[PDB]
Amino acid sequence: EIVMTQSPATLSVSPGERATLSCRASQSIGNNLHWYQQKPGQAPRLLIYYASQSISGIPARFSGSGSGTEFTLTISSLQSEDFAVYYCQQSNSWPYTFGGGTKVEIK
Amino acid sequence: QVQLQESGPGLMKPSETLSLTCSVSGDSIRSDYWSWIRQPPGKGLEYIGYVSYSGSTYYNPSLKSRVTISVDTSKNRFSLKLNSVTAADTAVYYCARWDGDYWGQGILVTVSS
Amino acid sequence: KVFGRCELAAAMKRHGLDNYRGYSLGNWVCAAKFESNFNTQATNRNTDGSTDYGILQINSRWWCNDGRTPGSRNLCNIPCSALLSSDITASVNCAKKIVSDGNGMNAWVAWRNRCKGTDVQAWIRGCRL
């Protein structure tokens, strides 16, 4: 299966700061990368699909970029409600796989 | 306004068969692809599998042919069946629409030996 | 819009079709060639009353809603008009869902009859990718 690796494992962010999360694929997956945000006791919520396509209702501060094997989720100016664990997931190959997650927490 | 809801036993013993169902409202079960995902406590996400419109299924090889996903068009819901469970199967199980736009809230299934 | 071969190859690659669920880029270019001849505005009314739309001739009986097909399941959750744009994003997203079904690319008659079994990678040969 395609192995997805996210970095860093934990990301400390001060409210108002720019946040950069990384996700890499063991092999090329084109633009078939999706980003999820998961808050405690809640189900993952899709924020970005197909690497950069935005979803209606999702704040503009969330932006996805990258292709092939290196992808990035950028939060231009993090707000307190953005603290959560973020996961990337590829859909280029079955079985679909998720990165190990990046825990974004307040600093 | 689509809503998914998982239901089933939250506690079971080793070797037994796990059986969960996900009921959908606001969308037709016969008009889309449906998936199951799980999250062991303190761990990340593992995709279990999905069923497409034609009824074809795709299962994660990590489950070793122990999984079944089926559709009940009459009650607008789909199910998950996982045989021979062990502690390794303890986790919050989530159902979601294949595109990922809507997820259930998850149901904790604990396999207590 | 009528795509040029390498122009489409590059677009589809940027849109993540190269090796999507096991299908090399050439397969997608070949399918577009034989289904619509690279024309995004292609439309073909079928006998059953449904219509095929776009560069990949996606049918309205199951995949999109043209508001004129009684059966319409609209599995891709999109108006068929979105498949007639020079922006292939909608067609690609729908094609990916289609191919994610058990039948894979067999969903496209043209691919099944003109691409499957041939040296499809020839369709991207000579293209900078």
Side-chain angles (χ1 to χ4, degrees):
Chain A
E1 56 173 35
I2 299 178
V3 172
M4 302 305 300
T5 306
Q6 282 175 265
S7 66
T10 294
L11 181 60
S12 311
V13 184
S14 291
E17 280 200 281
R18 178 193 183 71
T20 302
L21 289 63
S22 296
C23 166
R24 80 148 180 284
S26 58
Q27 57 180 275
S28 183
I29 56 173
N31 74 339
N32 302 292
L33 191 284
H34 315 288
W35 288 96
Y36 281 94
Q37 175 196 69
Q38 177 176 52
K39 295 179 181 185
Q42 278 179 33
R45 175 178 60 152
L46 184 61
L47 297 184
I48 300 290
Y49 71 113
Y50 285 122
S52 58
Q53 294 188 55
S54 40
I55 294 182
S56 59
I58 302 303
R61 56 175 182 286
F62 290 104
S63 180
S65 62
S67 63
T69 67
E70 290 302 325
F71 301 80
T72 308
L73 174 65
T74 301
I75 306 175
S76 63
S77 185
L78 184 146
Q79 306 198 338
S80 58
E81 63 276 19
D82 301 335
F83 298 129
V85 178
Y86 294 72
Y87 295 95
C88 61
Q89 179 239 126
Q90 65 79 27
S91 64
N92 186 70
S93 147
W94 182 261
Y96 297 159
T97 45
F98 293 90
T102 289
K103 188 175 189 302
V104 179
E105 62 190 32
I106 192 175
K107 170 177 67 70
Chain B
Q1 175 231 55
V2 173
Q3 179 69 247
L4 276 56
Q5 179 57 248
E6 303 87 347
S7 66
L11 180 59
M12 63 196 295
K13 291 185 292 297
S15 74
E16 301 191 308
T17 293
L18 170 161
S19 180
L20 294 176
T21 304
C22 175
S23 299
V24 178
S25 56
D27 197 7
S28 179
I29 201 76
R30 56 217 308 178
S31 294
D32 216 315
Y33 294 22
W34 306 96
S35 309
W36 283 97
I37 301 90
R38 66 175 186 179
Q39 179 168 49
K43 305 295 183 180
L45 303 160
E46 170 179 46
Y47 219 105
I48 294 172
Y50 74 92
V51 57
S52 55
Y53 118 99
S54 299
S56 57
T57 53
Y58 302 80
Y59 304 129
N60 192 324
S62 68
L63 298 179
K64 311 305 178 186
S65 302
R66 294 186 297 135
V67 56
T68 301
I69 293 177
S70 63
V71 175
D72 184 331
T73 67
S74 62
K75 302 192 69 165
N76 211 224
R77 63 185 191 185
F78 65 113
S79 304
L80 169 71
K81 176 183 177 183
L82 184 63
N83 299 310
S84 314
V85 299
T86 66
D89 299 305
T90 287
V92 172
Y93 287 74
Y94 296 100
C95 53
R97 198 167 69 181
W98 180 86
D99 51 36
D101 280 319
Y102 297 101
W103 285 57
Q105 42 179 40
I107 184 173
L108 175 67
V109 176
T110 302
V111 178
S112 293
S113 182
Chain C
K1 172 188 175 64
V2 175
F3 274 81
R5 183 173 67 83
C6 289
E7 173 182 40
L8 182 68
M12 294 183 144
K13 180 178 181 176
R14 171 62 193 188
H15 280 271
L17 286 179
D18 187 27
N19 291 310
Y20 182 80
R21 294 299 289 280
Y23 292 99
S24 66
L25 186 59
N27 284 286
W28 303 94
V29 176
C30 183
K33 166 64 179 185
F34 292 104
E35 286 288 348
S36 67
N37 195 34
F38 301 148
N39 169 42
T40 62
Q41 305 192 315
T43 62
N44 179 59
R45 170 182 292 298
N46 301 304
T47 301
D48 59 52
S50 64
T51 299
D52 290 335
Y53 298 87
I55 201 169
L56 284 181
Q57 291 297 78
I58 294 170
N59 177 282
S60 65
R61 181 126 304 179
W62 295 103
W63 313 105
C64 61
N65 177 54
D66 61 13
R68 184 181 58 185
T69 313
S72 183
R73 300 296 199 305
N74 195 184
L75 297 172
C76 284
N77 289 163
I78 55 168
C80 299
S81 63
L83 302 178
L84 295 178
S85 169
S86 54
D87 182 334
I88 69 171
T89 299
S91 280
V92 172
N93 289 356
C94 187
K96 286 180 176 180
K97 185 168 188 175
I98 292 169
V99 75
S100 288
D101 179 72
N103 206 39
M105 286 197 82
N106 289 294
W108 287 285
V109 179
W111 176 81
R112 205 172 63 219
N113 297 174
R114 310 295 288 286
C115 308
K116 183 179 175 185
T118 70
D119 179 37
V120 298
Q121 219 59 176
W123 287 93
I124 67 174
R125 184 177 304 166
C127 297
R128 300 306 107 69
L129 299 172

